[PDB]
Design a protein around this nucleic acid. Sequence first.
RNA 1: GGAUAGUGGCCUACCAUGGUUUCAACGGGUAACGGGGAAUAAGGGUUCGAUUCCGGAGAGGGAGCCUGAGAAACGGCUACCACAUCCAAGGAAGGCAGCAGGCGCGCAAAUUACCCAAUCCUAAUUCAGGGAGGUAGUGACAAUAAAUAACGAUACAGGGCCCAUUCGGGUCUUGUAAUUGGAAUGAGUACAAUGUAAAUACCUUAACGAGGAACAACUGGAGGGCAAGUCUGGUGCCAGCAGCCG
Lengths: 369, 182, 143, 55
Amino acid sequence: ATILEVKVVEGFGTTIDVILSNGYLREGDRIVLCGMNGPIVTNIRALLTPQPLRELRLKSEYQHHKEVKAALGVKIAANDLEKAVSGSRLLVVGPDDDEEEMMDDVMEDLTGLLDSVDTSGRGVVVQASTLGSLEALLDFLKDMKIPVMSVGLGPVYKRDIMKACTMLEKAPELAVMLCFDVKVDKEAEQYAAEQHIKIFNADIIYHLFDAFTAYQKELLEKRRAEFIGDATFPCVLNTLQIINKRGPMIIGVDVIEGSLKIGTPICAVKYDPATKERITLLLGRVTSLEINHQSVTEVKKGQTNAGVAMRLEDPSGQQPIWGRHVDEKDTLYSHITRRSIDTLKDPAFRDQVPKSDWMLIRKLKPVFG
Amino acid sequence: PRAPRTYSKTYSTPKRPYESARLDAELKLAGEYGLKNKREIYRISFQLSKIRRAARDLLTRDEKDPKRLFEGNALIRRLVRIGVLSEDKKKLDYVLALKVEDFLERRLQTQVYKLGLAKSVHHARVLISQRHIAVGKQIVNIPSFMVRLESEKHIDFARTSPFGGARPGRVARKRAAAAGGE
Amino acid sequence: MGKGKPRGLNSARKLRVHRRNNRWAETTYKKRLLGTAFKSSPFGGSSHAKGIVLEKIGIESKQPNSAIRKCVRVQLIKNGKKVTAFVPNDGCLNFVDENDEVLLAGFGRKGKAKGDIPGVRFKVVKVSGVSLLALWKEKKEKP
Amino acid sequence: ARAGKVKSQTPKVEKQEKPKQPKGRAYKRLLYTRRFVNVTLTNGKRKMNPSPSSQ
RNA sequence: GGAUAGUGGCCUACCAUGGUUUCAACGGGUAACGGGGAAUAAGGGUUCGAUUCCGGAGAGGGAGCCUGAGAAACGGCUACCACAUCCAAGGAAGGCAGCAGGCGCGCAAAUUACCCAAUCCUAAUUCAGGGAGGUAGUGACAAUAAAUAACGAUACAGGGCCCAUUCGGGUCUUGUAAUUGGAAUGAGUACAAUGUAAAUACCUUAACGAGGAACAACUGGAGGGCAAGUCUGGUGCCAGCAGCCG
């Protein structure tokens, strides 16, 4: 009396492979095994045999026995065991008793078993042929640090794909199928993408890690980068000359420190000098640049000795008129005061900002305040 | 696929639920005759309603013509046989004003008490349910039997059972074995 | 006074055809014949339907009173459309959980809003083979 | 709390060892004897579920 | 004329220009198989009829035939279009909208049991066979019948009152007590014998079987509609109730 595996076979449904030390079995007498969430009692549907090679391996055709004798392994077809965990003691009840008790013995081996499945986690979904491989796959993905949410067995249908589609709004790249050695209908593959899973079927088991991981690294590196733009990387600029004063403003700057970007907020500080004001505006941002004839992205630390020409747009407020408000001798800086550091962090990327930097965000602030 | 076995939902229900004047009327009916449910009052209501509808069909038709006379007579012959309708009121029109009290005072419940035997009404139902009272040569054990008027002459205790002959004790079987030792 | 309508012995045709036109000015007849229950009414013209929970939203009640009502956003299985259901009793949404199958039902108004809730036309009943009556009255727990 | 505060917050009072009610015909005889036969004390109109005489 | 078992534009050849139509043709939709019927019930009527009887279609989707009196048969065949098996890679074999059973779809539906004893049914046939059909299992789909205590004397106290010199006899009847007392009983379990194809189950009964702790009734209500709390403690525009008024 021992269960070995929980295979999903055609015709019978959820079968159970047993290994029998000593005893008798006949096609009719009920058993009392163990479910993950239910003490089961049920009849024998049928009883198979290999005749006389393999247990399962690949192909599927069996003999039919009315009664069998120990000691040998055998598949038992039966009813009301859609969940029925491996390693249970398959007891029998002929004329007497409501047995159980072994329920509590072997349900302690089930409670501390499949704890990796985060019941309300964040993806993905696993589907296996047998329950033995399903336990090993969860423990494999446990150490590689991929979160695992829901679990099932057998072939995948369209109802089992929406199973893991609560994460279409959140991630959205954390809602995929990791199918272990089982087929799909279509139907199912004609619902997958579509909208917008998608399936990764493999029959080894570190493919269906490598295929997932290679896919995952594409769209996490299309998030960071790109930011690029929005994230303002600070800078310092020596104003050498003035090309065109206004409409639009073109300034022959020279980069001392830090990186520049198409979309770096600029602020040339009138050095207070008492009130710590300036006040925070030099219109733009910078749409275009020019190293002689070439627009670039961008100059850091000091790539070119020749002076680079700026090109500032006109978004918010009055532009400081050149000569009156600001002049050639003022050093131009970035806009960074406080809320650029909201964009700082964005964990996992890292880098940028690289480990030589920054270092200048100890300097900032102040600077301004 | 032989013959769908035909059944009939006999006993029905009132139209309004919480009509307080009706509730008091139905309670005193249960208080007198010791009925368990409201269903046993509705038992008469439906079965009595069928007899009224049959009378309304036969009355509106012309007299001294076939069905009216033949069907209406068989209806009256039945109601005087069972003992609900009296012998001096075989006119069809009297069947319309029968009322529920005549049916409820023509059962194996009430007739056992009025003979004697049980005493205190509720005791009679307990005697009927516990395999006493053989009307013919066979033990009846339904309260809603409806006695046939002619058959009321034979209502006695059974030959077997307590108050009969054979069966002695149950509770006295304790006192038979125990008192024999002393 | 001839009462408008034709009172002829051979009027038959006009009496029948006049009423098949006037029958269209009744909501229950119009919706049965045209069949907006199949083509609309989020469900498939049915009593109950299951779905999966997406998020848990707190909805504000209307004017004279003032309170937050507690609701759940659900994706239906058979249709694929999304709705906003209601969770009854004190607490109760603690047992409902996120990312779980939930069986929905009507409110008892033939569509329409119920009481004081703006645009909430469904009610939560069961959560994975156990009703909220059973869980709220601690008699058997969730699986 | 923002999710069933009064369900947990209330003082917990428990059931008592009452003498059991009789079922069936015996319960209907109680209601017969209580209202009709024994005659309850009434000044003006009747009262099914009484109250303590206090404000 | 041809074909047909046989009538007919059913099909051809040469002619004639007719046929149906606001008394609704022609087209569209049907979450449409037609009836015998079912539900509701003053009289009239509304709504439903997949489904135990009768008739008609279809066997994954379309065409096509062979044998027989009778078949465009599908638990028979020949293709093409889907879907599917077994391969030693040469080729083989396919059709559950029969009976169980598994998938899937869903709010939504039973055992891979025992048997031809009945009902009938087929052959060359008293004899063989029949998942037609019957017998159990599962089954709060509906419907019928109706256990959970009954009678006592005391113990608590009310009602009638011969009379009410004050009482109280209490002659008559009632409801209240973990007082108590003898009497019943199948719900159970169980030799037998009936029952049955053989068994279960019912019906009859040997033996054992009730004392409030058990052999313990739930389900929804108590502001109005609508029968029923101006009851204690908690809660304080929150948590919640409420078909509607709130």
